Amino acid sequence: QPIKLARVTKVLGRTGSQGQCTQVRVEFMDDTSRSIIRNVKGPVREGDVLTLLESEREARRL
Amino acid sequence: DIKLFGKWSTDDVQINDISLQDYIAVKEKYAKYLPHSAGRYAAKRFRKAQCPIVERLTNSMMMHGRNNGKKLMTVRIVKHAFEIIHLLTGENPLQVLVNAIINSGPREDSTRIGRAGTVRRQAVDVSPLRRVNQAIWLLCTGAREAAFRNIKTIAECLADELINAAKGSSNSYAIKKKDELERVAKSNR
Amino acid sequence: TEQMTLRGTLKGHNGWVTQIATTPQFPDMILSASRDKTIIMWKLTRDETNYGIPQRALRGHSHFVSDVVISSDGQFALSGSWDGTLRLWDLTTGTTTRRFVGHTKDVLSVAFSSDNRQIVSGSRDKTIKLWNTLGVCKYTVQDESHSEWVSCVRFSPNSSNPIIVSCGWDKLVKVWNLANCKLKTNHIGHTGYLNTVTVSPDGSLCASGGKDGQAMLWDLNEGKHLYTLDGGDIINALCFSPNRYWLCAATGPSIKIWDLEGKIIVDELKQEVISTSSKAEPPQCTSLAWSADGQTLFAGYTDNLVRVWQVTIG
Amino acid sequence: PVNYYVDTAVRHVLLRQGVLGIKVKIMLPWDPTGKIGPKKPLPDHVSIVEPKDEILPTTPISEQK
Amino acid sequence: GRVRTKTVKKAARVIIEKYYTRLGNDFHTNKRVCEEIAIIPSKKLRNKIAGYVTHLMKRIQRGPVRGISIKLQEEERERRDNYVPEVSALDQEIIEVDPDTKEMLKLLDFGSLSNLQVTQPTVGMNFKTPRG
Amino acid sequence: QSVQVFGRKKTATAVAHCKRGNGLIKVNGRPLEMIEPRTLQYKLLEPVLLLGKERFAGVDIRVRVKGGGHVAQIYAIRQSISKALVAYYQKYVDEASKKEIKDILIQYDRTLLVADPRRCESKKFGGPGARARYQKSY
RNA sequence: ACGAGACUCUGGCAUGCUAACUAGUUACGCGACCGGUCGGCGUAACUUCUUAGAGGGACAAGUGGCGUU
Secondary structure, eight states: OOOOOEEEEEEEEEESSSSOEEEEEEEETTTSOOEEEEEEESOOOSSOEEOOSOOSOOOOOO | OOOBTTTBOSSSOOOOOSSSSTTOOSSSSOOOSOSOOOOSGGGSTTSGGGSOHHHHHHHTTOOSGGGTTOHHHHHHHHHTTHHHHHHHHOSOHHHHHHHHHHHHSOSEEEESOTTSOOSSOEEEEEOHHHHHHHHHHHHHHHHHHHHTTOSSOTTTHHHHHHHHHHHTOTTOHHHHHHHHHHHHHHHTO | OOOEEEOOOOOOOSSOEEEEEEOSSOTTOEEEEESSSSEEEEOBOOOSSOSBOOOOEEOOOSSOOOEEEOOSSSSEEEEEOTTSEEEEEETTTTBOSOEEEOOSSOEEEEEEOTTSOOEEEEETTSOOEEEOSSOOOOOOOOTTOOSSOEEEEOOOOSSSSOEEEEEETTSOEEEEETTTOSEEEEEEOOSSOOOEEEEOTTSSOEEEESSSSBOOEEOTTTOOBOSOOBOSSOOOOEEEOTTSSOEEEEETTEEEEOOTTTSOOSOOOOOOOOOSOSOSOOOOOOEEEEOSSSSOEEEEOTTSOEEEEEEOOO | OHHHHEEEEEEEEEOSSSEEEEEEEEEOOOOTTSSSSOSSOOTTOOEEOOOOOOOOOSSOEEEOO | OOOOOHHHHHHHHHHHHHSTTTOOSOHHHHHHHHHHHEEOOOHHHHHHHHHHHHHHHHHHHHSOOSSOOOHHHHHHHHHHHOOOOSSOTTOOSOEEEOHHHHHHHHHTTOTTOSSEEEOOOOSOOOOSOOOO | OOOOOOEEETTEEEEEEEEESSSOOEETTEESSOOTTSSTHHHHHHHHHHSOTTGGGSEEEEEEEEOSSHHHHTTTHHHHHHHHHHHHHHHHTOSHHHHHHHHHHHHHOGGGSSOOOOOOOOOOSSSSSSSOOOOOOO
C-alpha cells in the first residue's frame, strides 16, 4: 500500500472493551477531500500526524 | 548556545519524519546542561510532551528493585555510554538517538476490535506519543536484559542497543520488537 | 475639537492599572498603581518601540494599591492599599520611614495637601479620617459621617481655605472645611452610588461621577448643581484639564472630551481592537490624567495597558 | 459545627432486665452576644440584610439640616 | 469538579435580586459588597458566592436570565419592549384571500371591501401525509 | 545586609546575602563550583552560564542553604542565586536589564525563581506510604 | 430538612503587619598579600531566612473552543 500520512482533525471519542481505542477523524494532506475515521492506540492529541502505510481499512462508525 | 552536557550540540539534529517531531524535543528551547530536572511534566496532559527527549530517556532508565529512584545514577550511566557511542560512531549522539527512536517507535499494532470485542485483536494506528513511550521502554528493557547475566557491565548495553536501533541491527531489542508489533498488526487485519 | 491620535503599543503592566498620577514637575515622571501588588514608575522616552520603561519597583503592601498621588513635585508619592495601610514613598531609594494605619477595612483613595499637612483618605470602614503627614494628633470629628462606604476624597490645589469633597456609596456628596471640620453643604440627587468626586484647581468648581449615570457638576462656593450632563454608561473617574474648562471622564471603553464652547459633543473618539469577534468585552478605563505639557493623555485600562494619546490634527 | 452546635451526652441507665443506653443529643440554637448559643452561625447559613427603602431622588436638591 | 452548590447559587441569586444596584462586573467589588451586605461566615464561601455573582452579572449582560427576575430591571425591560413599527404589519393595501373566505365575507355583509384579492385555489386535494 | 530574597526547594531553603563586589560567588564556605556531587554541578552552574559571567561580576552574593538531602539542597542554591540577582538588579540598577534577565531565566526554566510547591505527603495507617496499602488475602 | 458541599486542621505565597541575647541576619580586636574563609570569629544596618499570631490570597476570576448556546 502507498505510504501517505494523515493528520488528526477531530477526536471522535473512545472505543474498545476497556475503552483504549480512540476514534479520530484523519485527513490526508493531498486533496483535503477525504476525512476517514481511524481508531488509534495510546495518548492521542488533536493536530498531530499519523504515519499510514495502510489505509484500505476503516474504523467502525455510524 | 545551549549544549547538552558540555559538548553535544543541538543544531546537527533533524527529525525528517514529520510523524513524531512535536513529541521529540532536542533542538527547541528545551536545551539543558544536565539530564536531571524533575519538573511537572507528569502532572497534566498537553504538558507531558514538552519534556526534552533526553530528559524522558534518562527518566525511564532506572527501574527494577533498588535501581528505581536513582536518577543521578542514570545521569552517570547516560554520560557514560554516550561518550561510548560518540567514540564508536563519531557521529552526534542526539541524532543517532533520534534515528533509533524513529526506527523503533511502532506505527500500527493491535487493540480491541472497534466498537466491541475481546476474542481477538484488531490493528489500529499507534499514536506518536505512545510510540515514543514504547520505543524508550524497549530501549531500556533491552539494555538491561543485555546486561543481565552478562560479563559486560552497564553503559555498554545501552550504547550497543541504541546504536543497533539507530542502524537497524537485529541484535537491537527495540527495532526487533518494533517489527514484531507491525507483524502482529498485519496478522490481525 | 483637536483630533486625537495614538502612540503605538507598548508593554507596561500585567494587571489592571488601578491609579495614575502625573506630577506638575516633569513631563517624563508618572506613577502608576496596579493589581500587580506593586507601584510602578514611568519615565517617558518618546521612542517608537518604548515610551515608559520601568526603572524602580515599589513593593510595600499586602493588597491592591488602591490610589497613588503626588501633590506638586516629583520627590515623594502617597499610596493607599486595600488593607487600610497608608504609605509615602521617596523615589530616591525606594523605601519608607513611616506607616499610617487608621482604617480597619478597605482604603480606596488618599488625598495629599499641596502644603503637605493633611492626609485625607476614603475608606470602606465608614469613617472619614482627617490626619497629617508628621503624625501630629489633631482634633477630629466623627459626627455627620456617611451611612455607607466612603469612596474618593480629593484636595483643592490653591492657597486658600482647605476643602474636602467626600463621596460615598450612600449617593450623597458631603462638604468639609478643615477649619471647622463640619458639614458645610450636603448634596443629594444621585440615582446610584457615587464613585469619584473631583475638584478643579480654580477653587470654584467640582464634579461627581459614579453609577448614577450622570457626570453632573457642583459649585463649592455655595452648593448647587449647575450644568446638566447624562451618560451612556457608568462613570468611574473624572478630572479637568489644568489649562481649560474641559471635563475629562471615561465612559467605560471610550472617553468624554467636550469642547470649550458649551460642552457639546463633536465626535466620540472611539477605541476598539480590530477583531473578527464582537464577543470580547471592551476594557473599562478606570482612571486617566493629563501630562505636564497638557497634550498627552495617560490612562489606565482593564486590558492591563496604558493608552497614550496625543494631538496631531490635520 | 457539630462540636460546638451539638451537646452530646451518653449515659448508662439501670434496668431490671439489664443495662439500657441513652444518647441525648441537643442542637444548640444560635444567638449573638448571648448566653444560650455559639457566637458564630452555621457556616452553611448565609443571612442577608434587607436593603433600605429610600425613594430614588428625581431632581437634585440642596438640603440644609 | 467545580459545580456550584445550591447554597452558593441561592445566595448569589438573592444577592443579585436584592442588591443589584451596588453589584458590578468586577469579582473583587462583588466580594467586598457581599461581605458588607450579608453575613457570610466563611471567606471561601464568600468567594464562591462572589464568583457566581460575577457570572450571573455576565449572564444579564448577555441579556435575559432564566433563573432570576428583578423588578428594578423589569420596568426597563418593559420600557425597551414598547416597540411600535412605523407602518402596521396588518395594514396591507392588498390582502390575498381564498374564494371560500370571499364567499364567507360576502355572506358577512363585507363583500364590498376593496383590499381583498381573490386567490387561485389549489387544483388538487393532496394535503394528507402518505400513510405508513 | 541582604537583598532579602530567599529561595526554596522541598524542605530546603537558601538565601543569598548580597553586597557590592566583583562577582565572587560562595556557598557556605565554598564557591559555586566545588560542590560535592560533581554531577549535579551543572545544576549549580545553570545560571552563571545561562546568562553569562559578566552579569555575575559586579555583585557579591553568599548563598547560605539549610535543608534536607543533596539534590533538595540544590534547586535552592541556584534558584536563590538567580532570584537574588534579579532582585538586586530590580532594586538597585534598573528594570530593563532586570526584565531581560528575568525573561531569560523564565524562558530557560519557568521554575527558576518560583518555588516548587510540592511537599512530601502524609502517611495513612493501614499502609506504608501515602497511597500504598497493606496487602491482604481474599 | 439530614447526608454531599459548606466546616476545621493541614500543604503551598505574602519582604504587607503585631516582634523575638530559649534564632539568626546585620555589630570586628590574624585583615594570615599590597579586595576576600568564620558554625578556624584571629573573644548598636533588625525580623530576610526561624518561629503559626491577626489579616490577605483563588473565585472557574480573564481569553479561546465545545455545550439546551
